[PDB]
């Protein structure tokens, strides 16, 4: 895992391109995916950590 740079990430089969950084969104234990107003993924929990 790498942060702060453009990378072709793949999380649990979900693919996307972007810059990954720590997020302050306090996801509840059941929550796994955050979405913006455009229904596009903007936050996620890594399965290994």
């Amino acid at each position: 895992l790498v942060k702060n740079k453009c990378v072709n990430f793949n999380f649990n089969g979900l693919t996307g391109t972007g810059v990954l950084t720590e997020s302050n969104k306090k996801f509840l234990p059941f929550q796994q995916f955050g979405r913006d107003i455009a229904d596009t993924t903007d936050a996620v929990r890594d399965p290994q950590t």
């Binding site: 107003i37 455009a38 229904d39 596009t40």
Partner: protein, 48 residues
């Protein structure tokens, strides 16, 4: 001259108060910004 000056200054003061107040006479500009904003939101939401 002096009376006209006083009236002019008082008018300017009342304009300042009216704009300073909660009045929203600026609605026309707000419409221009708001309409474009919601149009953008609609276009973005269409991707889903």
């Amino acid at each position: 001259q002096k009376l006209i000056a006083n009236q002019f200054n008082s008018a300017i003061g009342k304009i300042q108060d009216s704009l300073s107040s909660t009045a929203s006479a600026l609605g026309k500009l707000q419409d221009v910004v708001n309409q474009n904003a919601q149009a953008l939101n609609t276009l973005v939401k269409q991707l889903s």
